[model samples]
Target: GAQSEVVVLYPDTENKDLDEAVYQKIFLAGTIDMDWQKATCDWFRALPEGRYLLFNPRRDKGLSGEMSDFEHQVNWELEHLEKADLIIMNILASSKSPITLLEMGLFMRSGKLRVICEPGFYRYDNVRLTCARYGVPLYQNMDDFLKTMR
Candidate 1:
């Protein structure tokens, strides 16, 4: 039996039906912001299509509900991380994203993880050391990362 086609899913996207044909590039997991009221979906809008299927877990609206709904969101993201080919995490200085830090710790040794910790992040040194120890590539800023990706 063959494996089912990998669905290119964005947990925060308005439409959850974007699954299509299989390709060599499975998914690029964006472990970044997940603002409920103000979705930051554009973070990966510049990515070249057909090269990779992107996943950003931030929802477009307030995900206020029972604990099960919140659990579902977390589970969906975990599933993506398990199946993703590449994981890109950018730590912005504007917000203290503790969740991103947690994800970084979990995936630091995955060998598919790339990170960019912006200046002013409280835990930049931790991420830097982890990346160095694990040999994961860490970029300083978005321009440097985009340049390499290009």
Candidate 2:
């Protein structure tokens, strides 16, 4: 009933380094939250082969702006859902946006999603709940979490 291979979707802040060095390959999307970025950098470096696309209007205009554009992005996220087998929501030093939460939930309810949430971010309670409700285990760091990954 499920796809044979897993396509893990990681939604994290480009604003701060996530130590993507943790994996051989990684991908990122959405806007980079500053202030936080200003605070941390020398701490870690993202891994190589790391593909990142931020919320730059000129580049991904369909992913920015007003009501209509946001709806379009949501639709696109859902379309991608059909092909993904796992979703790793790394809410590190990041805030939650309502639209993305909905998209995450749609995948969770589909019952084939293997999700993970890390750091149990404080300010983003919505994301905490999204991960919690979906039975996606929470962790403090990548090493501890990856040990159990399938």
Candidate 3:
């Protein structure tokens, strides 16, 4: 049997702010379309060194429908989970994707994983509740998170 699983979804790149917690590194998780990789890479390029984005890109591969890609990507994400010191889930303000939900559930179950969920354009009541239920810390905006870096 498999040991464990997790999902990493990052936030929208429009005006995202990075939280500089005490962690040694930051791992970003989110859905990046094939057409959006370049722009994302550019965004990453602007980020300070030592900070990383562990994007799933499952959506770009057309795996947003059912569990088909979920199962496969879970394996992929798990491979990186162990190496990640912090998780930055970019669910965004009000975006709702079943795959994203499944990913959040998996990560929450992961012990000792410092999770930071960045809401999208549309916020969700259930999202905050789920994070609270799983002990995942929530941040309204990146700046809000960064201010706590001290």
Candidate 4:
């Protein structure tokens, strides 16, 4: 049986308590398509049992709500980003990903960020230049993106 767990830590969300002893923690920091998100979770689940903790921001509550909840969510995300060992950002081609872009700028100098931007993404050029300036590795495809993690 698997001993590891993935926890959904967000304001007003219900989830299992995460054990702080896990060594590998990955933060999924980009687009929020349910299908895409679930598939990504599946990938993390397939990793070696008891070795990974995937922090997903998605919850039963939507991002839309009162101002206070929004602030709480933003603060929670920032806190996790500060602690996450790896931040994987995937900017899908079909979506604008405005918030994800904002996060990219926020942690551009963190040195723990990896970006996978679609070639046709609206801000592709801008992201490219920023990554180059910061010396952050940017990938246009999944294979290339995974290569940087190891």
The candidate maximizing TM-score is 4
Backbone clash pairs for candidate 1 read none
Instruction: Tell me the tens digit of each residue's lDDT in model 1 across 46-130.
Output: 4445334556566556578878888988887777776777776767767677777777778888887878778777777887887
List candidate 2 segments past 4 Å from native. Answer: 1-71, 123-134
Clashing pairs in 4: none
The candidate 2 region of ten consecutive residues with least summed lDDT is 35-44
CA lDDT for candidate 4: 0.74
- Candidate 3 segments exceeding 4 Å error: 1-25, 33-74, 109-123
Runs in model 4 deviating more than 4 A are 1-17, 147-150
Candidate 3 accuracy as lDDT = 0.50
Question: After best superposition, candidate 1 residue 119: deviation in angstroms?
Answer: 1.1
Write one digit per residue (lDDT tens) for candidate 4, span 1-150.
434445434445544565645657677788776445556666555544546556667665476778988888888778778778888888888878899989999889988898988898888899999999999889986657764543
The lDDT values for all models are: 0.62, 0.40, 0.50, 0.74
Question: What's the TM-score of every candidate structure?
Answer: 0.73, 0.43, 0.50, 0.81
Residue-pair clash count for candidate 3: 15
lDDT of 1 at 47: 40
Candidate 3 per-residue lDDT over residues 65-114, each given as its tens digit: 46765766666566545456655555554444566566667677765343
Q: Residue 129 in candidate 1 has what lDDT? A: 85
Candidate 2: what lDDT? 0.40
Comparing 3 and 4 on TM-score, the stronger one? 4
